[PDB]
């Protein structure tokens, strides 16, 4: 019902967004589309 | 009264918690200076110009005379390491006091001690705090004078021989020179205080500023605001914040122009060439190349009828031609040897250009401060290859943005401080709407 | 009843049909000077050598322009950022040839517009209002500073400021894109979103309030007569509007607090236009839009073009043609 | 009360996402237009239609990905999956540009579905249908730009491709080829879009700075109640302020909100008319009087002639790569260029 | 008493399910080399 | 298409001997060219003197021919004008002048080979783009 | 002001929800990854791999130039790679 506290769900979800987006920006400098 | 998104406004009348917020925030500032310097140093390569490496703090230290020798060559990186470690260490002490005063310390100070406690409306106390900080600032400016005169000097891009560290023995004290700057026009060829082009004036200005600040600090510790000042201002914490926001705004705009135009306290050796500098260097480069091929650059008429390489400014000075005609107010150490009383001297141009001047112009022309947000260097149509954005573009743009927002911050808090002081910041009283007791306009 | 106090009472009087105020004391002369010079120049000024190459550009109606092509032309590149008032010229003829009127107009206007913003604060204070309408206006004002002052400062010349004319504006735009790739700059992208979104929400709010007007008139009269100026009761049913819009999307995507809604209406285009003003203001220092030219190459190293490379082709065309006689050297560094 | 009424009942149940009869058209078509765009920008090339990479799979980023228009050789083919060009081969269909028609056609029917939804919900709730009427403006823009415009030209190829930078290319194409900034129908659109954004900001700010004090908190949001009868801000003070600041002010709350509907909707409708003209190359490209004088008098120069030189650079420099099916070979010596550059 | 499967449930997963699949595919793409 | 040994095969000297680079050497030479040369020679042009480019046909007609590894390695040690008549070490980066061009200090002999190999391979991939300038962007 | 569905905040803070979705989410992420790492995405969509935009000595785009032979034209371009 209200087990996992909401503020913990938001933190983990938010850091998951940061990870995925960060990996896309790393990819702008490596491999395809990096100009190298 | 305030929602969570305005939560720091709950600190307005909690002097002990507000002290913790300020001191913790100071630790953040000193932390960034410490960590950024180490990051820059960890990434530093001495064989590359600083401005090819995205450095903004190391160039500030080098300008003070630490770590560099003739020509701006980095000779010793240890002063960079020390400046960064000492800042980094000090942020722990400020963080420690900050969080203590914000969480555990007394919530308000005025019960604990009449010295440290304050009421925003106490004009005597407020000007006393101001005076203390004025003295600190005045000491701060004298530290730069101390470094320049007694502890090794400052880096001087104008020094004969390519630039070098130089002790300043004759700072300018003549107030006609020092205050003459404050009264120069900000327009082209004049440049207000941004035109300061020698270290003697820089050091002399800081002697003056230190004395004025210390004098003003003692003045404000000893006095209370006069009645004309009392009737002209709003006396509240938010009003004081709004005044400082306006001041920071003005200073950010000035700093923007300082880093964009000035190559004295922002040496091009470290920060790269200025916009005007790089544009002048391109004309120089092709003057040199064409003249070596046999071109008589003095007599060469360009497509418009103006000289292809050399023309006159609107007041007659011989200057570089092309679109760089706009940049003829540029002055720099690699170019001044070619200047006579009427501008660029054609005899010196024919006979006295040195290889070091050819190299420098080629270098500056190919490091003009143009680049993309993803750090592709050059004009916007250039292909990928060169990873470069000038430190001057980074420092100018960042501080223009900050200066703009702080001007908006000033408007926001100035208007609110006025409304709060008069009692209508929360909206219009339905039972006493001023317009309803006014006559109509028609 | 002192003479200075009587003047002071008139300047700040809330009974003047148009509020004057202390900001108005500066605003009224500077705006009149700028307006009068602009009208006269637009109609009659002779051609101006904007680029300093002795190639004058005709901007005024009497010299063969219409409303769309006419302009007050920016001042000569030979002047750069030098201050050029009338009394620095040997003659008005000189001052006109070199584009002196543009400087007089933009300086008087930026001063008068800045005081216009202050005047908005000032009257709000005399009427007992909240103070932040002037903060909304700082977004268009900052945009005017960017194209009239900031961009010339960073580029070194008022000759690269935006002309006071319709076709001159488009000229400024095209050249800006060739040299800064503004379309690929995120602050301009945010400006488009502030301007597109502002138009969207204007139409949304207008249609939702109009949709939920309470029946107060007959079919033979304008519904507008169902509202009387200064009536105490609201004129539409916000719960009905909320009930419609919440079902059009989903419930929690619709406002039912009018204060929150109108604050949102204020903030979206204001912040978007702040960013686009900041975009011009930072491209003034040549921090340009994203460059993905030749960012995709294949296993051998062949360039694989993207739409960014097509943009570059168009930008190259604008680059090579603009100011076709003003460049003697290969790089257009300013 | 037969099967039709029973279905009516279920479609109009009050639920988290209202469905309605309009939902039968809207939800499939909206989902497919959107899913088609995300699929194409993640996975699908434009190599065979444009000579362009255009997907994340190929190395593109969010700004450069696109679902690109079909090759010029397809004309205005519907490019049905089962049609004569792809012949039911899903892979060939992607490579020939079929996702573009898929998205444009499903998007069009989704827009219809959305406007019917606005009608349907308004009828059930009991409000006037002005939100639907305002939405006519985005519809006119979409159909004029994505359908009418390429239908007047040689092929779909010249419609906008669905991507950030592809649309940027569309803007610049229209400058250099149509001189679209010079077109009074676009200028009226500009005034409607910027006038709408102005009205949005100025109205929001005015309400927020003429509020009545209806609570004691410093956050003034809490002092509003959706069922209160009373106006939450002072129209009388707002009118006085603007009358003294600007000379004139609104006095009628109904006119004001109608005008906010009117200004951006009308602006968009005007621009759509101008694009319909450009479908036929019916441009406002030139002023004949300027051209006659400038041809005869080489000292006559305006911002108008300056811009046409820019347009000529754009055309000659982007056309070979932008219209690859035409096999334009422009030797270096024919390219228009000013001095040095 | 709350149902588990609703029209809402369908709409949510209609969007959420291919979204995570797509994020997985785009993540893998960051490691492709030419 | 791919980086095959045939494209990675470039002349070693004027005599006609050839050398076949590795992919690694090509990528190394591209990185080093960007580090030490691209600020003036991006895309095979010369920003400060556009009359002279890095196209193979241009290098072939220089005196000392420079369309081979040896000629290019020698140029990076002791650059001359295009006719061979004067040494230009004091205005052009080289090992002979690494005191005034500090980026040349830490280039080893194999770095020079990779840089030279990059310059010779790249026109084989890019064609007219290499040294063609903005017309071919 | 509710339509009878279970509130979202109740679902995502519930244990059972996380029991199911700590499996379903990584599985979907892994499936999408494999769609690319196995190369299936190239084949399904016909997207060139980095080695198959051009033939070895080829600098011409394989542009479709016929409406009704288009499918065959692509197929001939592909053969000329292998
Ligand atoms: C209290 C209220 C105050 C109100 C005051 C009202 C009057 C203000 C006047 C401001 C207008 C000034 C425009 C600046 C023009 C320009 O050339 O300004 C640049 C000048 C620097 O001038 C340049 O200064 C140069 C100095 O360099 C010289 O010296 C150097 C020394 O090393 C080098 O050698 C260099 O090569 C050499 O040329 C040269 O003189 C150039 O020719 C000259 O252009 O900067 C400056 O004076 C520094 C300050 C400029 C700040 C202006 C920023 C405006 C921001 C507006 C904010 C927008 C508001 C948003 C509203 C919403
Ligand atoms: C989900 C959301 C989570 C995150 C929320 C944050 C939202 C906003 C921020 C977006 C973050 C995404 C991008 C982060 C990665 C990035 O930027 O990555 C970029 C770099 C790291 O990348 C490095 O970027 C470098 C940039 O070049 C720099 O380094 C080069 C090589 O030394 C040259 O020296 C060149 O001149 C110099 O500019 C090179 O390209 C390196 O190869 C590359 O590794 O991070 C940096 O720099 C770090 C910069 C952060 C400090 C901010 C400073 C910016 C102040 C300038 C702003 C002025 C405003 C102007 C407005 C326009
Ligand atoms: C707002 C309302 C909202 C509701 C919107 C809902 C969206 C519904 C979906 C719309 C479907 C439209 C697709 C129509 C395709 C079309 O037109 O496709 C075009 C084809 C004609 O085909 C084209 O024909 C051209 C001319 O060919 C002719 O000329 C050649 C030269 O001699 C040869 O002789 C050739 O054999 C001969 O056929 C070229 O060959 C093109 O390549 C080929 O595509 O017409 C046909 O299918 C039919 C055309 C005739 C019927 C006209 C229908 C009107 C619709 C367009 C009206 C706008 C008109 C724009 C003008 C500006
Ligand atoms: C520089 C940023 C900054 C600083 C210094 C402060 C400081 C403060 N805020 Mg503000 N605040 C900020 C940003 C900041 N805020 C932002 C961005 C928001 C928007 C979300 C808010 C919203 C906000 C609200 C809504 C409120 C405050 C309040 C407060 C005060 C009490 C907070 C408290 O007791 O928390 C207690 C919190 C904890 C005990 C959790 C642990 C926090 C610790 C300090 C983390 C520090 C970790 C650090 C690594 C320690 C290093 C130790 C080492 C040096 C030895 C305090 C002075 C409150 C106030 O005014 O009270 C009257 C209040 O109500 N703030
Ligand atoms: C401007 C910042 C500032 C201000 C106004 C205050 C003010 C106060 N603090 Mg706080 N504090 C600060 C920073 C600050 N502190 C920092 C940085 C720390 C961490 C070290 C602390 C840690 C701290 C603790 C742990 C306690 C206080 C207490 C107090 C109160 C009594 C202090 C007293 O009588 O000392 C008398 C004055 C001195 C002993 C001064 C000695 C000489 C000093 C250190 C020289 C200063 C160095 C120089 C000027 C600048 C720094 C050098 C640097 C730039 C390299 C007073 C309200 C006490 C309190 O509230 O009691 C409940 C208490 O227990 N403070
Ligand atoms: C952080 C710095 C600071 C701050 C915030 C204050 C704040 C204050 N001071 Mg103090 N003051 C300071 C530093 C400071 N002072 C220093 C260093 C000195 C020594 C020189 C003095 C000397 C001083 C005196 C002698 C007096 C004050 C007074 C006052 C009060 C009224 C100020 C006023 O009306 O300004 C508004 C400014 C004016 C009315 C005139 C402005 C004229 C300037 C030069 C215009 C130029 C602005 C221009 C647009 C920007 C370009 C700069 C230009 C110079 C080129 C106020 C509490 C007054 C008071 O009540 O003291 C008890 C007073 O009589 N101050
Ligand atoms: C020294 C500077 C300074 C100081 C001390 C204050 C202090 C204050 N301000 Mg002011 N403010 C400032 C500058 C400053 N402001 C500037 C420059 C502006 C213009 C933008 C404003 C605009 C402003 C408004 C509009 C309001 C205040 C308010 C307030 C009060 C509440 C602040 C709060 O709780 O925020 C809490 C903090 C947050 C909610 C978070 C802010 C998050 C920012 C916007 C995001 C920045 C991200 C950054 C770009 C980096 C992105 C990277 C990514 C990883 C995030 C407090 C008295 C409020 C007030 O009037 O109270 C009396 C109020 O409503 N301020
Ligand atoms: C600007 C500061 C340059 C840098 C950095 C590099 N080069 Fe250069 N290069 C430059 C000029 C002005 C010239 C012409 C010199 C002359 O007057 O003859 C050159 C020439 C070359 C050549 C010869 C080209 C030819 O014969 O066609 C080569 C092979 C060359 N440069 C190579 C080169 C390398 C390998 C660099 C990085 C180590 C490099 N240059 C940097 C200007 C500049
Ligand atoms: C109040 C509050 C807040 C804030 C806070 C703050 C802001 C704080 C600060 C803090 C700080 C500011 C901290 C600091 C820290 C620091 C430290 C802890 C340091 C340490 C260091 C070290 C340990 C080092 C080491 C080294 C050396 C020595 C050498 C080199 C290397 C190295 C680096 C390793 C918040 C918002 C959260 C919330 C609310 C409340
Ligand atoms: C260091 C240096 C130097 C020097 C400097 C100086 C010496 C400075 C000074 C400065 C100054 C000396 C400043 C001043 C300032 C001022 C101001 C800034 C003012 C302000 C004002 C105001 C703001 C006001 C307002 C008002 C009014 C008007 C009305 C009434 C009300 C009020 C009050 C609000 C030099 C350059 C040489 C060189 C380099 C270094
Ligand atoms: C076409 C087609 C089809 C369909 C398909 C579909 C339907 C699809 C879908 C699809 C989908 C449905 C997809 C999705 C995807 C998504 C994504 C990929 C997303 C992403 C996102 C992101 C990246 C975000 C993030 C962020 C940021 C960045 C910032 C802020 C925060 C956030 C978190 C928001 C079919 C079968 C019929 C067949 C035919 C063809
Ligand atoms: O863009 Mn191109 O860059 Ca800024 O200057 Mn050099 O040319 Mn000219 O003055 Mn108007 O314009
Ligand atoms: Cl032009
Ligand atoms: Cl030039
Ligand atoms: Fe409203």
Residue numbers in the entry:
A (entry chain J): 5 to 40
B (entry chain C): 32 to 473
C (entry chain A): 11 to 344
D (entry chain D): 12 to 352
E (entry chain F): 12 to 45
F (entry chain V): 1 to 137
G (entry chain E): 3 to 84
Task: Please quote the paper that reports this structure.
In natural photosynthesis, the light-driven splitting of water into electrons, protons and molecular oxygen forms the first step of the solar-to-chemical energy conversion process. The reaction takes place in photosystem II, where the Mn4CaO5 cluster first stores four oxidizing equivalents, the S0 to S4 intermediate states in the Kok cycle, sequentially generated by photochemical charge separations in the reaction center and then catalyzes the O–O bond formation chemistry. Here, we report room temperature snapshots by serial femtosecond X-ray crystallography to provide structural insights into the final reaction step of Kok’s photosynthetic water oxidation cycle, the S3→[S4]→S0 transition where O2 is formed and Kok’s water oxidation clock is reset. Our data reveal a complex sequence of events, which occur over micro- to milliseconds, comprising changes at the Mn4CaO5 cluster, its ligands and water pathways as well as controlled proton release through the hydrogen-bonding network of the Cl1 channel.
The S3 state was populated by illumination of dark-adapted PS II microcrystals with two in situ visible nanosecond laser flashes, in which the interval between flashes was 200 ms to account for acceptor quinone QA and QB kinetics and efficiently drive S-state transitions. In the S3 state, all four Mn are formally in the (+IV) oxidation state. The OEC is oxidized in this step from the all-Mn(IV) S3 state to the proposed highly reactive S4 state with formal oxidation states of Mn(IV)4O⦁ or Mn(IV)3(V). The extra oxygen Ox, present in the S3 state, is lost upon S0 formation, indicating that Ox may participate in the O–O bond formation, and changes in its density probably inform on the onset of this process.
